[PDB]
Amino acid sequence: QVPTRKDYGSKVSLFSHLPQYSRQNSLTQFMSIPSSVIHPAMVRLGLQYSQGLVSGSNARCIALLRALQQVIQDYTTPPNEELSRDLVNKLKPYMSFLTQCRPLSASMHNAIKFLNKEITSVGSSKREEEAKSELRAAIDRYVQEKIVLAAQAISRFAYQKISNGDVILVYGCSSLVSRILQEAWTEGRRFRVVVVDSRPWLEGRHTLRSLVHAGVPASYLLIPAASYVLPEVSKVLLGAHALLANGSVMSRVGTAQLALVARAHNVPVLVCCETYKFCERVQTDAFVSNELDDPDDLQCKRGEHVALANWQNHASLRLLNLVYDVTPPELVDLVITELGMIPCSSVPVVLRVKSS
Amino acid sequence: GPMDDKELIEYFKSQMKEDPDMASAVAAIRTLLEFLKRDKGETIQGLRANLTSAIETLCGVDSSVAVSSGGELFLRFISLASLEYSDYSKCKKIMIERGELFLRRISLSRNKIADLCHTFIKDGATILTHAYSRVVLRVLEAAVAAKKRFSVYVTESQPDLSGKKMAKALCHLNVPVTVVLDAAVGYIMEKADLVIVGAEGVVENGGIINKIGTNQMAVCAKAQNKPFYVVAESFKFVRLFPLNQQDVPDKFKYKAEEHPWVDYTAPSLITLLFTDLGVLTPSAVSDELIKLYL
């Protein structure tokens, strides 16, 4: 079957319950060529997941749904079996392999739940090709409604909250935030954007380029200097990887810190997120559920010496590369969704109306 | 005695009216020094009793905290002078000259505070003030003389519209000022960058006694992380420890349905105090008061 990826390095005691892998160490080195137990599309998708070729939550969800469409297209039913059960039982090992390559995002989990519900809803009397075409169409419609129209509606809503001459502070890379800012500039709003970035990913640079290509004036700085720039900031706009049932915002590490520092400077905090990223689970801190990236990414060349080189030689030394953090609902002023302008406490309400 | 209660009150009122710029505490201290000048006594006990009675009468004339603080400061000055010199005849001249120097210093205190405080105002800032205050007016005058540009918001100070007087005095030197209601301090707090107010009396723990609208203004400034600066002279340091608003003595609340004239602001709501002793934390007032009284 599929072997188990080996943990890399020594983990912090408080984070010993979470996996921690190495970027160089791939899993497909122990898998057959051509791939038999795992569909080739899933193998390629996991390969680009583990190497970080696709990183955004929306991008990861879109790539996963495209790979699932390819798998459904290549799928055939076995004799004396049902489509609804066999497809799910065949997809389960693929999702396990993908999780082994990299822990699944919340949007990925929601997409998996939606696809499983759609497959289970396929009638037994339905023809194979008709069922496959219907599944592909359902995946395409899900992508459309949950991404494109949602982003358009969120941008339309956020246009009303952006005024001429204000300063908006953004963090990291978020397609929704960049799209919102681009349309806001296009419709005629005149403003400037402050971009905040953090090591080691430095994803914010991406957004910076987008702004430079849109004509929007922009500024760049690292997260520790955020407290220096917030006095001139009029509002903070943040993307979200997930919204939890208690109203807390699960996002890239440093988002909660930025929200706290903005609260200390009396500036409003707005979080933009599509409703398909809402989660029924709850989480009070960043320790119980999180992702451990490659610790070797923390090594930086300052001058001619790398201080963290061969850090595993020291027995007591540990390297922590946290991926996500949780912002409490009391640190978020407004949430912008495709449904409208709602507070954090309304997150469960949406979860009640989307399900039924 | 040589000076009677009637002419004591007359001298106090005349000294206040002749120089409207001088504060009530300075006028009270000047009146007490003049009373000491013409006493015709020979015993330091009778002088102390007569000065205490004169301070009681002066505080009966006007119910301001600053007058009582000046009276206590004068009593401590007399006690220190008596401790220094045992003979009353040699002590009286020392008291007179030391009082003259003290009057000069408390006259220069306002300019000292303005010079030490104007630096905290930035270009394009929005200063929020509560009511009329000569020290705040002088601070803003010194800031304007430094070629600094800023806006000012004032509150109308409903019981007596001294906020309108402050706004007119600020317009006199061409300062962009706005007048808001006493109910609009919380609404306008987000526009202001820092808060400067006066103080009628500085209590032992670092808090202040001020006009009725000061406490809510300080609470609103605290709720929005805005610095709360207080300008106050040294002769307004009083050894009072009010636990709450009801703990303030009734002789200062009224006669100056229910309408108190003063409130108390806790030291935790105050960023810095600007006095003639310098820029101080609220903890320094207690140290000063402890050092003064042995």
XYZ file of C-alpha atoms in Angstrom:
650
model
C 0.000 0.000 0.000
C 1.064 3.592 0.680
C 3.931 3.901 3.194
C 3.929 6.336 6.096
C 5.974 9.518 5.765
C 8.723 9.786 8.368
C 8.771 12.727 10.759
C 11.765 15.040 10.359
C 13.699 16.619 13.211
C 12.757 16.990 16.858
C 9.457 18.689 17.681
C 8.579 20.990 20.562
C 6.939 19.117 23.434
C 3.739 21.176 23.222
C 3.538 20.380 19.479
C 4.532 16.700 19.721
C 1.008 15.601 18.712
C 1.314 17.117 15.220
C 3.249 15.739 12.232
C 6.333 17.500 10.902
C 7.834 16.548 7.541
C 10.821 17.494 5.392
C 10.346 19.277 2.073
C 13.065 17.277 0.306
C 11.739 13.911 1.519
C 8.963 12.922 -0.885
C 6.679 9.898 -0.574
C 6.479 8.855 -4.249
C 10.064 7.581 -4.006
C 8.507 4.538 -2.287
C 5.638 4.198 -4.788
C 5.439 2.283 -8.054
C 5.864 3.833 -11.503
C 3.397 3.950 -13.127
C 1.187 4.657 -10.120
C -1.286 1.845 -9.434
C -2.595 2.092 -5.862
C -2.907 5.893 -6.223
C -4.376 7.641 -9.249
C -1.691 9.558 -11.203
C -3.586 12.846 -10.885
C -3.588 12.481 -7.096
C 0.113 11.562 -7.176
C 0.965 14.730 -9.108
C -1.302 16.849 -6.897
C 0.324 15.517 -3.732
C 3.756 16.093 -5.251
C 2.972 19.765 -5.833
C 1.381 19.966 -2.369
C 4.470 18.656 -0.569
C 6.846 20.878 -2.565
C 4.678 23.974 -2.105
C 4.014 24.558 -5.801
C 0.445 25.568 -4.890
C -0.139 27.283 -1.562
C -3.307 29.385 -1.511
C -6.402 27.885 0.076
C -8.564 28.724 -2.939
C -5.814 27.506 -5.277
C -5.444 24.273 -3.295
C -9.210 23.694 -3.348
C -9.389 24.372 -7.098
C -6.483 22.018 -7.823
C -8.028 19.311 -5.635
C -11.376 19.644 -7.407
C -9.697 19.483 -10.828
C -7.811 16.335 -9.802
C -11.058 14.846 -8.482
C -12.741 15.657 -11.803
C -9.915 13.868 -13.621
C -10.258 10.853 -11.310
C -14.031 10.722 -11.841
C -13.502 10.949 -15.604
C -11.006 8.069 -15.509
C -13.118 6.048 -13.048
C -15.022 2.909 -14.025
C -17.459 0.891 -11.948
C -16.571 -2.685 -10.934
C -19.031 -5.526 -11.585
C -21.536 -6.274 -8.812
C -20.946 -2.955 -7.054
C -22.554 0.462 -6.636
C -21.154 3.794 -7.807
C -21.996 5.679 -4.608
C -20.138 3.376 -2.214
C -17.276 2.273 -4.470
C -16.350 5.822 -5.493
C -16.120 6.986 -1.870
C -14.180 3.886 -0.799
C -11.759 4.446 -3.692
C -11.371 8.165 -2.943
C -10.604 7.623 0.755
C -7.023 6.308 0.211
C -6.353 9.180 -2.202
C -7.348 11.686 0.478
C -5.190 9.830 3.007
C -2.223 10.074 0.626
C -2.902 13.782 0.065
C -3.037 14.342 3.832
C 0.287 12.513 4.149
C 1.763 14.828 1.508
C 0.447 17.873 3.416
C -2.355 18.447 5.960
C -5.615 19.404 4.288
C -6.927 22.956 4.464
C -10.386 23.837 5.759
C -11.589 24.704 2.254
C -10.259 21.319 1.136
C -12.197 19.585 3.922
C -15.398 21.410 2.967
C -14.905 20.490 -0.698
C -14.331 16.845 0.263
C -17.516 16.840 2.348
C -19.493 18.415 -0.502
C -18.185 15.909 -3.052
C -18.877 12.960 -0.746
C -22.433 14.208 -0.210
C -22.874 14.614 -3.974
C -21.533 11.121 -4.711
C -23.687 9.514 -2.012
C -26.706 11.276 -3.554
C -26.150 9.593 -6.939
C -28.997 7.196 -7.638
C -28.281 3.507 -8.097
C -30.427 3.354 -11.249
C -28.436 6.234 -12.772
C -26.221 5.358 -15.725
C -22.447 5.442 -15.315
C -21.652 8.085 -17.938
C -24.624 10.218 -16.878
C -23.512 10.023 -13.240
C -19.934 10.962 -14.149
C -21.083 13.916 -16.265
C -23.407 15.074 -13.478
C -20.574 14.843 -10.941
C -18.259 16.862 -13.195
C -20.961 19.493 -13.740
C -21.631 19.637 -9.993
C -17.922 20.174 -9.306
C -17.760 22.952 -11.910
C -20.883 24.633 -10.506
C -19.498 24.359 -6.968
C -16.251 26.016 -8.054
C -18.136 28.781 -9.867
C -20.644 29.633 -7.134
C -18.336 29.197 -4.141
C -15.317 31.064 -5.606
C -16.033 33.441 -8.485
C -19.494 34.792 -7.657
C -18.614 34.850 -3.954
C -15.502 36.939 -4.642
C -17.477 39.302 -6.881
C -20.161 39.794 -4.221
C -17.557 40.294 -1.485
C -15.754 42.899 -3.603
C -19.049 44.692 -4.257
C -19.784 44.736 -0.517
C -16.274 45.915 0.385
C -16.429 48.754 -2.153
C -18.905 50.549 0.124
C -16.483 50.387 3.080
C -13.528 51.888 1.159
C -13.428 55.690 0.965
C -11.146 58.173 -0.763
C -7.944 59.044 1.071
C -7.884 56.155 3.556
C -5.083 53.724 4.404
C -5.762 49.974 4.262
C -3.345 47.531 5.897
C -3.097 44.027 4.423
C -1.145 40.953 5.507
C 0.478 38.206 3.452
C -1.085 36.939 0.238
C -4.833 36.581 -0.282
C -6.545 36.434 -3.668
C -9.759 37.868 -2.212
C -7.977 40.884 -0.695
C -6.088 41.640 -3.911
C -9.258 41.273 -5.986
C -11.170 43.585 -3.635
C -8.436 46.223 -3.775
C -8.143 45.972 -7.567
C -11.858 46.516 -8.168
C -11.963 49.274 -5.540
C -9.184 51.100 -7.390
C -10.869 50.421 -10.742
C -14.256 51.899 -9.793
C -12.558 55.177 -8.870
C -11.559 54.980 -5.217
C -8.245 56.695 -4.460
C -6.245 55.304 -1.543
C -2.965 53.684 -0.521
C -2.254 50.159 0.713
C 0.182 49.053 3.421
C 1.487 45.505 2.934
C 2.725 43.461 5.903
C 4.921 40.398 5.387
C 6.459 37.710 7.583
C 9.219 35.126 7.271
C 9.903 32.561 5.929
C 7.197 32.387 3.254
C 7.192 36.118 2.391
C 3.903 35.690 0.532
C 3.004 39.370 0.911
C 5.475 40.244 -1.846
C 3.079 38.552 -4.277
C 0.287 40.963 -3.353
C 2.736 43.863 -3.592
C 3.479 43.025 -7.223
C -0.243 42.846 -7.984
C -0.751 46.292 -6.477
C 2.202 47.660 -8.445
C 0.609 46.241 -11.590
C -2.753 47.845 -10.744
C -1.426 51.374 -10.189
C -2.381 51.365 -6.496
C 0.231 53.074 -4.280
C 1.706 50.554 -1.868
C 4.088 50.264 1.071
C 6.051 47.259 2.308
C 7.288 46.261 5.759
C 7.730 43.238 8.004
C 5.331 42.241 10.776
C 7.470 43.387 13.776
C 7.292 46.988 12.504
C 3.487 46.917 12.183
C 3.042 48.907 15.403
C 5.105 51.667 13.773
C 2.764 52.045 10.788
C -0.699 51.548 12.358
C -0.980 55.171 13.619
C -1.386 56.261 9.977
C -3.543 53.243 9.038
C -7.279 53.850 8.661
C -8.465 50.226 8.486
C -7.052 46.696 8.456
C -8.288 44.204 5.843
C -7.413 40.546 6.399
C -8.055 37.358 4.499
C -9.108 34.206 6.308
C -8.216 30.572 5.738
C -11.214 29.481 7.827
C -13.924 30.818 10.123
C -14.807 28.671 13.125
C -18.187 28.140 14.764
C -17.288 30.352 17.748
C -16.468 33.304 15.479
C -12.688 32.991 15.736
C -10.599 33.459 12.592
C -8.125 30.725 11.656
C -5.531 32.231 9.333
C -1.825 32.606 8.600
C 0.303 33.002 11.716
C 0.645 36.664 12.643
C -2.943 37.609 11.778
C -4.110 37.539 15.405
C -1.055 39.547 16.465
C -1.825 42.160 13.806
C -5.451 42.314 14.957
C -4.331 42.819 18.563
C -1.881 45.584 17.633
C -4.560 47.266 15.501
C -6.972 47.112 18.443
C -4.265 48.750 20.559
C -4.199 51.600 17.999
C -8.008 51.950 17.678
C -8.264 50.969 14.003
C -11.118 48.825 12.623
C -10.464 45.227 11.591
C -12.316 43.666 8.651
C -11.993 39.998 7.692
C -13.036 38.863 4.216
C -13.949 35.207 3.747
C -16.220 33.147 1.521
C -18.960 31.200 3.285
C -17.649 27.874 1.950
C -14.626 28.263 4.258
C -16.835 28.271 7.371
C -16.196 25.345 9.718
C -18.401 23.680 12.321
C -15.427 22.897 14.572
C -14.177 25.191 17.330
C -10.658 25.996 18.488
C -9.455 28.173 21.368
C -5.696 28.304 20.679
C -3.100 27.532 18.013
C -1.669 24.508 19.860
C -4.427 21.893 19.573
C -4.747 22.043 15.767
C -2.018 23.477 13.533
C 0.528 22.555 10.864
C 4.288 22.132 11.296
C 6.252 23.196 8.220
C 9.881 22.336 7.485
C 12.057 23.715 10.325
C 15.019 24.139 7.957
C 13.103 26.982 6.284
C 13.856 29.091 9.374
C 17.562 29.151 8.477
C 18.647 32.532 7.109
C 22.014 33.751 5.827
C 22.783 36.873 7.879
C 26.200 38.011 6.686
C 28.522 35.101 5.885
C 27.339 32.656 8.581
C 24.086 30.733 9.022
C 23.502 30.478 12.768
C 20.844 27.750 12.466
C 22.930 25.495 10.208
C 23.158 21.927 11.543
C 20.796 22.902 14.357
C 20.052 19.226 15.075
C 23.562 18.811 16.516
C 22.419 20.584 19.691
C 20.208 18.121 21.559
C 18.197 20.762 23.433
C 17.642 23.008 20.394
C 14.234 22.952 18.708
C 12.898 24.797 15.663
C 9.198 25.696 15.517
C 7.626 26.697 12.188
C 3.969 27.392 12.934
C 1.700 27.788 9.911
C -1.625 29.004 11.332
C -2.981 31.020 14.237
C -6.387 31.801 15.732
C -7.809 35.295 16.230
C -10.483 35.576 18.941
C -13.821 37.044 17.802
C -13.380 40.045 20.118
C -10.424 41.232 17.995
C -12.408 41.348 14.717
C -14.747 44.262 14.042
C -16.445 43.209 10.795
C -16.737 40.117 8.594
C -17.395 40.528 4.861
C -19.056 37.574 3.128
C -21.133 37.102 -0.006
C -24.232 37.176 2.222
C -23.480 40.702 3.445
C -21.766 42.589 6.250
C -22.038 40.413 9.370
C -20.274 40.240 12.759
C -18.186 37.304 13.938
C -21.006 36.041 16.170
C -23.076 35.469 13.008
C -20.673 32.786 11.722
C -22.710 29.886 13.221
C -25.917 31.450 11.868
C -24.549 31.173 8.328
C -23.581 27.573 9.086
C -27.226 27.031 10.030
C -28.643 28.561 6.840
C -26.161 27.073 4.354
C -26.756 23.502 5.542
C -30.545 23.940 5.562
C -6.655 92.368 64.683
C -4.702 94.681 62.381
C -6.650 93.271 59.430
C -10.313 92.327 59.807
C -12.375 89.658 58.059
C -14.222 92.266 55.980
C -11.065 93.921 54.669
C -9.407 90.508 54.278
C -12.178 89.470 51.881
C -11.987 92.901 50.243
C -8.235 92.547 49.663
C -8.679 89.031 48.267
C -11.405 90.135 45.847
C -9.523 93.290 44.826
C -6.328 91.354 44.108
C -8.315 88.835 42.062
C -10.114 91.574 40.105
C -7.093 93.808 39.439
C -5.218 90.962 37.691
C -7.740 88.557 36.114
C -4.865 86.415 34.813
C -3.699 85.434 38.305
C -5.274 82.249 39.652
C -7.363 82.034 42.815
C -4.670 80.135 44.732
C -2.011 82.743 43.923
C -4.329 85.537 45.069
C -5.115 83.645 48.281
C -1.412 83.112 49.001
C -0.734 86.800 48.327
C -3.550 87.769 50.702
C -2.160 85.458 53.397
C 1.326 86.938 52.966
C -0.139 90.446 53.251
C -1.967 89.345 56.408
C 1.343 88.109 57.811
C 2.958 91.448 56.920
C 0.554 93.358 59.207
C -0.113 91.119 62.219
C 1.342 93.046 65.200
C 1.821 89.744 67.031
C 4.704 88.386 69.080
C 3.867 84.664 69.391
C 4.169 82.012 66.691
C 1.180 80.172 68.195
C -1.126 83.159 67.766
C 0.260 83.759 64.286
C -0.505 80.150 63.338
C -4.017 80.341 64.804
C -4.708 83.669 63.088
C -3.428 82.306 59.768
C -5.629 79.219 60.142
C -8.665 81.419 60.811
C -7.781 83.596 57.809
C -7.487 80.494 55.614
C -10.875 79.309 56.886
C -12.407 82.681 55.989
C -10.768 82.709 52.546
C -12.018 79.189 51.812
C -15.436 80.424 52.901
C -15.148 83.203 50.322
C -14.638 80.738 47.456
C -14.957 76.953 47.579
C -12.072 76.053 45.249
C -9.657 73.244 46.089
C -6.689 75.383 45.024
C -7.363 77.944 47.769
C -7.301 75.248 50.454
C -4.157 73.725 48.934
C -2.466 77.123 49.040
C -3.564 77.574 52.640
C -2.075 74.235 53.679
C 1.116 75.026 51.752
C 1.364 78.372 53.554
C 0.832 76.665 56.919
C 3.617 74.190 56.133
C 5.850 77.094 55.082
C 5.192 78.817 58.417
C 5.929 75.605 60.321
C 9.215 75.118 58.447
C 10.247 78.734 59.058
C 9.432 78.383 62.763
C 11.488 75.183 62.882
C 14.450 76.963 61.275
C 14.454 79.985 63.621
C 13.336 79.804 67.250
C 13.061 83.553 67.886
C 9.854 85.056 66.501
C 11.395 88.448 65.687
C 14.157 86.885 63.589
C 11.633 84.440 62.117
C 9.170 87.056 60.834
C 11.615 88.730 58.432
C 12.714 85.344 57.080
C 9.066 84.405 56.531
C 8.391 87.683 54.710
C 11.364 87.404 52.344
C 10.783 83.689 51.723
C 7.146 84.465 50.943
C 8.191 87.125 48.442
C 10.464 84.613 46.701
C 7.675 82.013 46.845
C 5.290 84.484 45.196
C 7.827 85.123 42.431
C 8.275 81.389 41.826
C 4.542 80.628 41.766
C 4.177 83.513 39.310
C 6.844 82.022 37.014
C 5.350 78.524 37.386
C 2.800 79.004 34.586
C 5.445 79.980 32.034
C 7.642 77.112 33.240
C 4.785 74.652 32.659
C 4.068 76.100 29.213
C 7.725 75.883 28.168
C 8.041 72.301 29.430
C 4.693 71.176 27.958
C 4.433 72.771 24.497
C 6.859 70.180 23.086
C 4.292 67.360 23.374
C 2.053 68.851 20.648
C 2.827 67.725 17.097
C 2.185 69.367 13.747
C -1.323 68.645 12.507
C -2.422 67.251 15.870
C -5.949 67.433 17.291
C -5.931 68.543 20.933
C -9.035 67.881 23.035
C -9.688 70.105 26.056
C -12.567 70.185 28.521
C -13.195 73.767 29.676
C -11.426 77.075 30.273
C -7.922 76.839 31.724
C -5.312 79.596 31.731
C -2.498 77.028 31.847
C -3.859 75.201 28.790
C -4.298 78.539 27.014
C -0.683 79.483 27.756
C 0.519 76.038 26.635
C -1.286 76.445 23.312
C 0.083 79.991 22.987
C 3.621 78.653 23.416
C 2.909 75.881 20.899
C 1.627 78.423 18.362
C 4.685 80.618 18.952
C 6.768 77.571 17.949
C 5.300 77.720 14.405
C 3.182 74.615 15.012
C -0.166 73.940 13.330
C -2.903 72.027 15.143
C -6.651 71.923 15.724
C -8.432 72.185 19.072
C -11.768 70.829 20.285
C -13.394 72.243 23.423
C -16.538 71.330 25.339
C -19.137 73.943 26.220
C -18.931 73.151 29.979
C -22.681 73.322 30.515
C -22.970 74.629 34.133
C -21.121 77.800 33.085
C -20.101 78.130 29.455
C -16.377 78.594 30.059
C -15.720 76.434 27.002
C -17.092 79.216 24.810
C -14.756 81.646 26.584
C -11.822 79.311 25.913
C -12.852 79.031 22.257
C -12.994 82.824 21.923
C -9.604 83.212 23.615
C -8.153 80.620 21.231
C -9.688 82.326 18.190
C -8.006 85.507 19.434
C -4.635 84.061 18.357
C -6.025 82.456 15.159
C -6.246 78.824 16.260
C -8.718 76.520 14.463
C -11.070 75.494 17.264
C -14.413 73.718 17.497
C -17.076 73.686 20.217
C -18.885 70.449 21.064
C -21.457 69.486 23.661
C -20.527 67.852 26.950
C -22.327 64.766 25.603
C -20.067 64.674 22.513
C -16.725 63.924 24.198
C -17.001 60.211 23.442
C -18.197 60.929 19.907
C -15.277 63.288 19.202
C -12.632 61.255 21.062
C -11.632 59.256 17.973
C -10.781 62.482 16.118
C -8.451 63.798 18.834
C -4.852 62.630 19.167
C -4.187 63.661 22.782
C -6.016 65.277 25.698
C -4.799 68.255 27.742
C -6.822 69.522 30.711
C -6.227 71.682 33.754
C -6.532 70.726 37.399
C -7.930 72.603 40.385
C -6.194 70.217 42.794
C -3.767 67.285 42.690
C -4.619 64.628 45.284
C -2.105 62.457 47.133
C -2.255 59.377 44.893
C -1.689 61.313 41.652
C -5.308 61.825 40.635
C -6.771 65.257 40.011
C -9.789 67.301 41.059
C -11.270 69.180 38.117
C -14.511 70.387 36.551
C -17.474 68.012 36.556
C -16.862 66.679 33.039
C -13.231 65.620 33.484
C -13.746 62.063 34.765
C -15.903 60.832 31.881
C -13.526 62.521 29.434
C -10.580 60.644 30.955
C -12.498 57.349 30.913
C -13.398 57.853 27.245
C -9.769 58.676 26.438
C -8.656 55.509 28.242
C -11.188 53.384 26.345
C -9.619 54.509 23.036
C -5.938 54.446 24.116
C -5.545 58.192 23.964
C -2.916 59.953 26.097
C -4.413 62.068 28.888
C -2.128 64.953 29.869
C -2.745 67.210 32.873
C -1.173 70.634 33.397
C -1.237 71.790 37.017
C 0.813 74.057 39.254
C 2.724 72.796 42.282
C 0.716 74.815 44.816
C -2.319 72.636 43.967
C -0.829 69.521 45.599
C -3.229 68.464 48.372
C -3.017 65.527 50.789
C -6.452 64.130 49.987
C -7.228 60.483 49.204
C -10.744 60.186 47.752
C -11.726 56.552 47.309
C -14.585 57.368 44.914
C -16.624 60.318 43.654
C -18.736 60.425 46.826
C -15.540 60.600 48.914
C -14.702 64.108 47.640
C -15.338 66.677 50.410
C -18.686 68.423 50.051
C -17.126 71.870 50.551
C -15.609 71.569 47.053
C -18.537 70.000 45.174
C -21.163 72.687 45.786
C -21.410 76.486 45.964
C -18.691 77.272 43.433
C -31.665 68.916 41.113
C -28.107 68.149 42.233
C -25.150 69.741 40.437
C -21.627 69.027 41.676
C -18.976 71.402 40.377
C -15.934 69.093 40.611
C -14.983 65.458 40.100
C -11.972 63.256 40.819
C -9.843 61.442 38.232
C -7.776 58.434 39.270
C -4.011 58.361 38.590
C -4.401 55.258 36.405
C -6.323 57.382 33.872
C -3.528 59.990 33.637
C -0.483 59.611 31.394
C 1.750 62.465 32.593
C 1.468 65.633 34.678
C 3.125 68.894 33.617
C 4.063 71.018 36.640
C 6.672 73.640 37.446
C 8.663 70.756 38.956
C 8.778 69.150 35.492
C 7.105 66.269 33.700
C 6.048 63.762 36.349
C 4.267 60.470 36.689
C 1.312 60.422 39.111
C 3.506 58.507 41.584
C 5.786 61.544 42.015
C 3.057 63.653 43.658
C 2.913 61.279 46.631
C 6.710 61.398 46.924
C 6.619 65.207 46.891
C 3.911 65.337 49.560
C 5.758 62.812 51.742
C 9.037 64.726 51.420
C 7.322 68.014 52.297
C 5.805 66.686 55.541
C 9.010 65.162 56.923
